[PDB]
Amino acid sequence: SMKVSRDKDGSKVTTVVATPGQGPDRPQEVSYTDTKVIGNGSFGVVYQAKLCDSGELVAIKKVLQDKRFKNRELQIMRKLDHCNIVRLRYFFYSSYLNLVLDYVPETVYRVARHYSRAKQTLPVIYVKLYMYQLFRSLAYIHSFGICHRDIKPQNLLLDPDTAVLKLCDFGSAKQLVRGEPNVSYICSRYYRAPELIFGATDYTSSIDVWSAGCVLAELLLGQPIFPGDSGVDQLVEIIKVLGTPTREQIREMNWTKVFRPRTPPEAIALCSRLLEYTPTARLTPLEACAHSFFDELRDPNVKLPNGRDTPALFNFTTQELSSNPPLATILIPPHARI
Numbered sequence: 001s002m003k004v005s006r007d008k009d010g011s012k013v014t015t016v017v018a019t020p021g022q023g024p025d026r027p028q029e030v031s032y033t034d035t036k037v038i039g040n041g042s043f044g045v046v047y048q049a050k051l052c053d054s055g056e057l058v059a060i061k062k063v064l065q066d067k068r069f070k071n072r073e074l075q076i077m078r079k080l081d082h083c084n085i086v087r088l089r090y091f092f093y094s095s096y097l098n099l100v101l102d103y104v105p106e107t108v109y110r111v112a113r114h115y116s117r118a119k120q121t122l123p124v125i126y127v128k129l130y131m132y133q134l135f136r137s138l139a140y141i142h143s144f145g146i147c148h149r150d151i152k153p154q155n156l157l158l159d160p161d162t163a164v165l166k167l168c169d170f171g172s173a174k175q176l177v178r179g180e181p182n183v184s185y186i187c188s189r190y191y192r193a194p195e196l197i198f199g200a201t202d203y204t205s206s207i208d209v210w211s212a213g214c215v216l217a218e219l220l221l222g223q224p225i226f227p228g229d230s231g232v233d234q235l236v237e238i239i240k241v242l243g244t245p246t247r248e249q250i251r252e253m254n255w256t257k258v259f260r261p262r263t264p265p266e267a268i269a270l271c272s273r274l275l276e277y278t279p280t281a282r283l284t285p286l287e288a289c290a291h292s293f294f295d296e297l298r299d300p301n302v303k304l305p306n307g308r309d310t311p312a313l314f315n316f317t318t319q320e321l322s323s324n325p326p327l328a329t330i331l332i333p334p335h336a337r338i
Contacts, residue, residue: 128294
């Protein structure tokens with residue numbers, strides 16, 4: 001269980017025995033301090049803390065664990081190991097369930113909002129950096145047949161200096177199996193795919209791609225691209241830009257004057273190949289990554305305005321490239337093969 005002592009210069013210490021996020025079940029003594037109720041999601045409470053030894057800042061999502069069954073989020077995160085997904089350091093139980101995750105102060109939402117308020121705009125380099133990493137994180141979890149289902153600016157954590165992004169909050173994630181139906185009320189408003197809006201229950205993990213296209217379009221526009229208090233409204237906006245859907249386009253369900261001027265035409269192109277009525281016509285995460293819009297990232301001389309180097313972007317895995325191995329001829333740039 002957990003033991004809470006107070007030593008080392010007036011400071012409350014919580015000690016508990018938890019289980020490694022990944023790896024073989026081999027319990028350990030984890031001691032943290034400075035626990036502050038930073039977040040209050042819905043399913044439970046989100047705590048922020050400091051590990052006594054490394055001093056690293058972790059996050060603890062305490063949700064009401066039940067014995068009636070396994071915890072899908074825990075299960076899903078228990079099998080994810082990717083440089084673009086929040087890391088599950090440990091997990092343990094309290095009288096209910098606790099998820100000790102990496103802590104990341106900034107989010108795409110907060111950054112995009114900052115610039116949007118200052119009537120300014122984020123340098124495309126970041127747009128490319130962030131979107132790329134998200135597409136990679138999607139190719140990874142998709143490779144396991146897992147759909148996030150709640151891709152939104154707020155679930156995109158990012159380190160301000162390194163510029164590395166990490167997808168978080170898998171509380172809505174589910175492995176999708178053809179044949180099996182799924183609730184169609186799991187996505188965020190401004191990022192729900194038309195199918196979700198049409199109440200389809202046979203949607204594919206490509207709804208994550210639609211959302212991503214929405215994040216991208218939002219980053220370029222300074223505001224959401226398909227807002228609306230209701231579905232009807234949302235569809236209006238979707239139609240205003242994509243055009244009225246054809247009968248086929250619908251069955252499958254269930255630009256140049258949109259973005260500000262002087263805005264790269266590669267970015268506008270990608271958006272269009274991501275936001276398609278036909279779910280099966282949208283690019284796949286790997287195809288999104290190999291889009292020309294991300295060519296700068298492939299350049300060998302590219303760096304952050306910062307002067308620092310870009311985070312790893314080419315250390316792909318067989319797991320990652322499985323959807324289409326041959327895409328590596330574009331994905332992994334020459335200099336990376338030296």
